[PDB]
Design a protein around this ligand. Structure first.
Ligand SMILES: C=C1[C@H](O)CC(=C/C=C2\CCC[C@]3(C)[C@@H]([C@H](C)[C@@H](CCCC)CC[C@H](OC)c4ccc(O)cc4)CC[C@@H]23)C[C@H]1O
Lengths: 239, 11
């Protein structure tokens, strides 16, 4: 059974997401323009990422027990997870029809070529698109999606974590809420191994994140590309 | 500690 606390945790995560994710994509008009030339999509996409980093921080602050962490633990959890949560939350704009992220217009519709135009290769792109397709095929409830994002953020094994025990107790409450949720609310046959599948996606994001870092370091090595990023991205991903 | 912008968005 889903306790009152469990249901309250879920209600809070949904609202937090509803507050930090704008399915109209209206703000994208403020980004440097997309241009479709080496690295033509990088300014636009660097702005999209930096914007998304702010939304993810906003979401994280609303996670039950996250505010109980020290400032240091909050910073290290956000710094490692940011990219992963952005890949996760991006699933909402991803569409299987054209394997692309569709944000309401042709200008804000992003495909594999757009990503390559931001300085990425098939090495990262292929596993990213495969990740989006596998998540998409889970067809998660919105409740599940927002729980997965919270569980991704509050992982006790992220580098630089000091109070692993506290981070782990936070995550545990969220995992148990997810487990019970699937059991009580997710009907078969969709629920089959659903928890194990969602956890395997967290493993996939970690690999993707490891790969992303290598690419990010190669980009950080040419300061004329690094120049095109935002201050928040440099802070959060390093320089 | 080395992250003023992130720290300010956190508060
Ligand atoms: C509001 C939202 C979401 O927050 C984000 C949205 C889409 C997300 C997309 C679609 C475009 C491509 C995005 C932005 C990806 C970017 C390029 C990332 C792909 C790494 C794969 C492991 C990398 C971003 C990173 O920092 C800017 C970067 C950029 C350039 C580099 O050369 C190296 C690293 C991640 C997530 C991807 C739209 C919409 O659903």
């Amino acid at each position: 059974k889903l306790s009152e606390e469990q249901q309250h945790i879920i209600a809070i995560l949904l609202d937090a997401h509803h507050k930090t994710y704008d399915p109209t994509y209206a703000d994208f008009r403020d980004f440097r323009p997309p241009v479709r030339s080496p690295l033509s999509m990088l300014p636009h996409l660097a702005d999209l990422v930096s914007y998304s980093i702010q939304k993810v921080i906003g979401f994280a602050k609303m996670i039950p027990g996250f505010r109980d962490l020290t400032s240091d633990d909050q910073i290290v959890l956000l710094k490692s997870s940011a990219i992963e949560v952005i890949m996760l939350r991006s699933n909402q704009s991803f569409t299987m029809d054209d394997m692309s992220w569709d944000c309401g217009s042709q200008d804000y519709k992003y495909d594999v070529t757009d990503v390559s135009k931001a300085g990425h290769t098939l090495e990262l792109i292929e596993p990213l698109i495969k990740f989006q397709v596998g998540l998409k095929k889970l067809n998660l409830h919105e409740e599940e999606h927002v729980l997965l994002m919270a569980i991704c953020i509050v992982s006790p094994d992220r580098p630089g974590v000091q109070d692993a025990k506290l981070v782990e107790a936070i995550q545990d409450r969220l995992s148990n809420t997810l487990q019970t949720y699937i059991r009580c609310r997710h009907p078969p046959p969709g629920s089959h191994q659903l928890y194990a599948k969602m956890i395997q996606k967290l493993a996939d994001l970690r690999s993707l994140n490891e790969e992303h870092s290598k690419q990010y370091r190669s980009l950080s090595f040419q300061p004329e590309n690094s120049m095109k990023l935002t201050p928040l991205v440099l802070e959060v991903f390093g320089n | 500690k080395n992250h003023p912008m992130l720290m300010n968005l956190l508060k």
